[PDB]
Amino acid sequence: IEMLKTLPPTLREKKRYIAFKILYDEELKEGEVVNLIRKAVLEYYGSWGTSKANPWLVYYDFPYGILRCQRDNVDYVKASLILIREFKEKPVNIICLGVSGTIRKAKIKFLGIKKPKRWFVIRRER
Amino acid sequence: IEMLKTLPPTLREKKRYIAFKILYDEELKEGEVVNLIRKAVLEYYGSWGTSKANPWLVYYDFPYGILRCQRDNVDYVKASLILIREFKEKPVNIICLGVSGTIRKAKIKFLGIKKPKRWFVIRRER
Amino acid sequence: RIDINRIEKEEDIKLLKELKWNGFVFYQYDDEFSKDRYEEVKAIAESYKLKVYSGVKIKTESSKQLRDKVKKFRNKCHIILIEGGVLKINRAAVELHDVDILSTPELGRKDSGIDHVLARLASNHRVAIELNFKTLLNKDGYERARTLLFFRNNLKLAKKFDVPVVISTDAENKYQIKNPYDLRAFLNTLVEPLYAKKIMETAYKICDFRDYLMRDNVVRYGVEIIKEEKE
Amino acid sequence: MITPHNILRHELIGLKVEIVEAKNKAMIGIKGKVVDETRNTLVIEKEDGREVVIPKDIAVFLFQLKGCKVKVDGRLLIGRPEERLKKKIKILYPY
RNA sequence: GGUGGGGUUCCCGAGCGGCCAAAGGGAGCAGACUCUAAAUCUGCCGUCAUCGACUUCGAAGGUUCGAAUCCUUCCCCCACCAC
Numbered sequence A, B: 001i002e003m004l005k006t007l008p009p010t011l012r013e014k015k016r017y018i019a020f021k022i023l024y025d026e027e028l029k030e031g032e033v034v035n036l037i038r039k040a041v042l043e044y045y046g047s048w049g050t051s052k053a054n055p056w057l058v059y060y061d062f063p064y065g066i067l068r069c070q071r072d073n074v075d076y077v078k079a080s081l082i083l084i085r086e087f088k089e090k091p092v093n094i095i096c097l098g099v100s101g102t103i104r105k106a107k108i109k110f111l112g113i114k115k116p117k118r119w120f121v122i123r124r125e126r
Numbered sequence C: 001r002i003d004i005n006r007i008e009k010e011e012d013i014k015l016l017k018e019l020k021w022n023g024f025v026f027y028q029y030d031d032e033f034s035k036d037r038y039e040e041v042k043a044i045a046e047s048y049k050l051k052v053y054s055g056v057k058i059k060t061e062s063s064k065q066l067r068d069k070v071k072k073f074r075n076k077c078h079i080i081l082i083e084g085g086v087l088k089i090n091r092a093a094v095e096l097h098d099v100d101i102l103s104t105p106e107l108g109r110k111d112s113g114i115d116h117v118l119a120r121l122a123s124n125h126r127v128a129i130e131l132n133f134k135t136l137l138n139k140d141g142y143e144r145a146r147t148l149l150f151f152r153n154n155l156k157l158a159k160k161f162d163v164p165v166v167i168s169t170d171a172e173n174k175y176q177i178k179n180p181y182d183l184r185a186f187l188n189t190l191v192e193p194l195y196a197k198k199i200m201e202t203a204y205k206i207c208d209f210r211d212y213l214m215r216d217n218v219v220r221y222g223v224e225i226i227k228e229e230k231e
Numbered sequence D: 001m002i003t004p005h006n007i008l009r010h011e012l013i014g015l016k017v018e019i020v021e022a023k024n025k026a027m028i029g030i031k032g033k034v035v036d037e038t039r040n041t042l043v044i045e046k047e048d049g050r051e052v053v054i055p056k057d058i059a060v061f062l063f064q065l066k067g068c069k070v071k072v073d074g075r076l077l078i079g080r081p082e083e084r085l086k087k088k089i090k091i092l093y094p095y
Numbered sequence E: 001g002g003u004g005g006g007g008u009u010c011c012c013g014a015g016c017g018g019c020c021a022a023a024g025g026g027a028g029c030a031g032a033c034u035c036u037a038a039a040u041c042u043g044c045c046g047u048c049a050u051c052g053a054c055u056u057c058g059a060a061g062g063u064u065c066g067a068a069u070c071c072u073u074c075c076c077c078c079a080c081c082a083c
Helices: A030-053 A074-082 A103-111 A119-125 B030-053 B074-082 B103-111 B119-125 C011-017 C035-045 C065-074 C087-095 C116-125 C141-159 C180-190 C193-215 D081-087
Strands: A015-023 A056-059 A064-070 A093-100 B015-023 B056-059 B064-070 B093-100 C002-005 C023-026 C052-059 C079-083 C101-103 C128-131 C165-167 C222-224 D016-022 D031-038 D041-046 D051-055 D059-064 D069-073
Touching: A015 A074, A015 A103, A030 A056, A030 A064, A030 A074, A030 B030, A030 B074, A030 C141, A030 C180, A064 A074, A064 A103, A074 A093, A093 A103, B015 B074, B015 B103, B030 B056, B030 B064, B030 B074, B064 B074, B064 B103, B074 B093, B074 C180, B093 B103, C002 C193, C023 C035, C035 C052, C052 C065, C052 C193, C065 C079, C065 C087, C079 C101, C079 C193, C087 C101, C087 C116, C116 C141, C128 C141, C141 C180, C165 C193, C180 C193
Parallel strands: C002 C023, C023 C052, C052 C079, C101 C128, C128 C165
Antiparallel strands: A015 A064, A015 A093, A056 A064, B015 B064, B015 B093, B056 B064, C222 D069, D016 D031, D016 D059, D031 D041, D041 D051, D059 D069
């Protein structure tokens, strides 16, 4: 088996979760969102900043979305979100709602109302 | 006439001059050097770092070259010089010789022997 | 300032000496090593002005039968490297406490470089982490991002536990090699310049220790001099 | 016979010794024999006549054998000589 | 955050405080056997590789006439838990 232990929280990367929206009347696949956010995070950070602020999209079902960040550099990720201009025929709009430390709290502040827990049940049932 | 005064040296940008070489048996035009160093300086800096460290090539006649930099971030420009990997059929090699504050001193330390002054004569004769 | 690369021609190494480099390591990534290659290493090292230390390398074999055979092939050469993304061989490689430097946690794994238990066991057994750079020059953009994220994670896990780190380019050709000031400025760009100097200091001291160990009659750091009772 | 390899387990008492490097500046330059030995300590009687108490882990020792002169750390000589001849394996990395 | 446990040879696994006591099995090498090979048996079995002797029972300290074993500490590896 290939298993890696999670680092202790004094040594692990301090993270934040940015909740945002990709506003347009057009539609997107989540892989297109990952591709555009990788191109933009390169275009604003280089190798140095992308090693610095740790970008990874975690959720995109609706035009809303949730992405993970380092704690000291959420303003850098937001400035990376501003400089979207064009994707191959058209722009997309990226508009941030807020930022929190978890999904249950950022889900209820701007995104929705209830607090879901799906990772536990897909780990224990499957 | 369109003229802009040079900023006073307490307020102007503190600059350094990196002398380097583009080692290959192949040949390059200086515009190709400017294009590759712009693509690489984007790919390592983004908009933020390219506003930060001020890249501009000033000289390329031989495979040696001279480029201008900000003073606090010459290590960032060098790390931008390392990550050259490929240009459309082939790499180019970028190898730094040194860094100084002017052309007459960086020209004699690694590049050549004598100290030329060409800007003054092309300004006063032409 | 010590590099780790393979030898192809003499002009490349003559260009290496003319810049800053005082010595380097010849890299044998194969299972067929003989004295002819090492004599050619001697000839090219005595060609202009240099000293080269040769090593051997293994990849993708068994768990601890490989450990015994690796010790048996290591008893002929100076230093050694074991590369592999498998954690199972990595535990034994940091457990056997005789490998000098360790590489490849990022491209065979693509999940995370060093585990916390792995870093604590490396602190007890004193094995060093070697950071390659040819992996940076044969990837794409987000691959560079994930790879340097892994290197910054491993840099923290080596800084907090005082794990020795050796930087190298892991070169393969004439032009894959880069400058030592470049690598120092890049490790300055990542976290700190003092740790960047400490990496080069450790890279010199580990080869100095292996040379001082295999040079004379030295067993568990015991120096024996003139008028020996040696059998 | 006393061998430079098994000097990690041979008895140190009854052998002339001088130390060459130590962190204590006045410790450097002594010459004498070994009389008493505890876990990280030698009691050395000088030729001049002064008994000195030398800790092992801070210095390196040069033991004078029958003709030989062997340089061994006292970090390798950690432990009482009873436990040292029982079995003590010490691996030192001066990085 | 919690309970019941395990770490011994290259891999799976036993072992009264005591003569490598270290059951072992599979593996490697060699012998034997066969036209060749499989299976069975024999010795080395980690080393010298004929008897025999020494080292390793996760690591350190301590008890003892003497530690895989008894005590303490440091660790890791299992199993299962949100409802």
